[PDB]
Copies of this chain bind each other. A is one copy, B any other.
Amino acid sequence: MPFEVVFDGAKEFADLIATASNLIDEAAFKFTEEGISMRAMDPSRVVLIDLNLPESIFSKYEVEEPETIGINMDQFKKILKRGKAKDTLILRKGDENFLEITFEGTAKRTFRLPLIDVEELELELPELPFTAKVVLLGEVLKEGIKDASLVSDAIKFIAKENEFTMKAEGETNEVEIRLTLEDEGLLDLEVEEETKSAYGIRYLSDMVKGIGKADEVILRFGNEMPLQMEYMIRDEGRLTFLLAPRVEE
């Protein structure tokens, strides 16, 4: 139960947990000898967020025993609003339900909070054949989704051999973006067959606005199977969103 994690500057982790809170409120961080893990489902059982951070991310990391703790997303969002980019985040926990967040600098800050428990059921996602993989930049996808957000909500991604297309249909508007290997927004392609699927972009737009511009993304999808967008944190941690498309035309 007791642990201590010290890191000089955690604005990335702050905005990450802010996006997780905007996604869902009930979340439990499992602390194991390897690091931290979290898996948040959806109240409408349509979206799944997963994150893992090993012990090669923060500066100081001392854990006693692997367990599962819970932190309120509202109480955390009421905490990250004071995180300076040049601060030293220190998360301390003992045996009692007291969580300490410490910051060292021009004034020693220390906030104590109660620790409630979360009992969300965890189940391993079954393996599914992707048949479509691609690695792109985050800024291009973010600006495309922000340009196609106001016209409609169903954005259609089509992928063929060395070809990608992001389109936005409708009745009084149409948007189209082409992507090839010699373009300025595609890093690499691993397409297998001709796939095409339309997805909603509310949670998409929120989660891609929460992520910075220089970060990269890896999309895995198929014909009509759910999409998985993954990315890496400091080349050590992993974070993946997963959500199914719509059946309509």
Which B residues lie within 8 Å of A78 (CB)?
150-151
Question: Which of B109, B140, B175, B183 touches A147 (beta carbons < 8 Å)?
Answer: B109
Q: Mark A137-164, 1 if CB is under 8 A from B, else 0.
A: 0001001100100110000000000000
Binds B, one of A62-70, A110-118, A195-203, A238-246: A110-118
Write the nearest CB–CB distance from A64 to chain B, whole angstroms: 23
Q: How many copies does the complex hold?
A: 2
Question: Would you call A184 an interface residue if the criterion is a C-beta within 8 Å of the partner chain's C-beta atoms?
Answer: yes
CA distance A87 to B104 in the complex (A): 42
Contact A110 B175 (CB under 8 A): yes
B109, B112, B177: the one contacting A109 at CB < 8 Å is B177
Interface size in chain A (residues, C-beta < 8 A):
28
Contact, CB under 8 Å: B108 / A177:
yes
Q: Is the CB of A178 within 8 A of B82?
A: no
For the complex, give the distance between the alpha carbons of A178 and B108 in Å: 6
Contact code string A164-196 (vs B, CB < 8 Å = 1, else 0): 000000001111111000011100000000000
Is the CB–CB distance between B172 and A113 below 8 Å? yes
A56 at the interface (CB under 8 A from B): no
Cross-chain contact of A175 among B109, B114, B151 (Cβ < 8 A): B109
* Cα–Cα distance between A59 and B6 once the two chains are bound (Å): 53
CB-defined contacts of A184 to chain B, threshold 8 Å: 106-107
Question: Is A75 among interface residues, defined by CB-CB distance under 8 A?
Answer: yes
CB nearest neighbor in B for A175: B111
- Min C-beta distance of A52 to chain B, whole Å: 29
Best-surrounded residue of A150, A173, A178 (most CB of chain B within 10 A)? A173
Q: In the bound complex, what is the Cα–Cα distance between A185 and B109 (angstroms)?
A: 12
- Bound CA span A172–B107, Å: 23
Which residues of B lie under 8 Å from residue A175 when comparing CB positions? Answer: 109-112
Interface residues of A in 71-128 (CB under 8 A from B): 75, 78, 82, 106-114
Asked whether A140 and B174 contact (CB < 8 A) given A78-B150, A150-B78, A151-B78, the answer is: no
In the complex, 17 of the A-B residue pairs with CB atoms within 8 angstroms, ordered by the A residue number, are A82-B143, A82-B147, A107-B143, A107-B185, A108-B177, A108-B178, A109-B147, A109-B175, A109-B176, A109-B177, A110-B174, A111-B173, A111-B174, A111-B175, A112-B174, A112-B175, A112-B176
Give A residues with C-beta under 8 Å from B: 75, 78, 82, 106-114, 140, 143-144, 147, 150-151, 172-178, 183-185
